[PDB]
Design a binder for this molecule. Structure first.
Ligand code: QO6
Length: 118
């Protein structure tokens, strides 16, 4: 009975502050764990710039833009896509960032998203 989309405010973390640098050891695990942390309010977002991905652990979980036609209520519609060894699992739009566990790090911003609970 979960709705197809949920509005979330994600803490945006700087890469060098992140204590737990990924969600696990396989594509299926990272997607699962990312979803669980998103549900629990314990998921952060790192914006991708040069140097960021090499400082994080693969497989990566990205949130990517799902629709251009509109962004309801200020929350960009996004979906999850994992990457391992240059191969992506999911096909979507532009990356908003890479998801990581949040364990109390102080964010630099909050990113409002409307997440597809695929
Ligand atoms: C109320 C709600 O939809 N919570 C929620 C938030 C994020 C996620 C879920 C559930 C399941 C998949 C990821």
């Amino acid at each position: 009975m979960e709705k197809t989309h949920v509005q979330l405010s994600l803490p945006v973390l700087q890469v060098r502050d992140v204590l737990v640098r990924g969600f696990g050891d396989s594509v299926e695990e990272v997607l699962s764990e990312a979803r669980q942390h998103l549900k629990d309010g314990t998921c952060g977002l790192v914006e991708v710039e040069k140097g960021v991905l090499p400082q994080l652990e693969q497989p990566y979980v990205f949130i990517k833009r799902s629709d251009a036609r509109t962004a309801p209520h200020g929350h960009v519609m996004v979906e999850l896509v994992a990457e391992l060894e240059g191969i992506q699992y999911g096909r979507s739009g532009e990356t908003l960032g890479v998801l990581v566990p949040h364990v109390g790090e102080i964010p630099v911003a909050y990113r409002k998203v409307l997440l597809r609970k695929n």
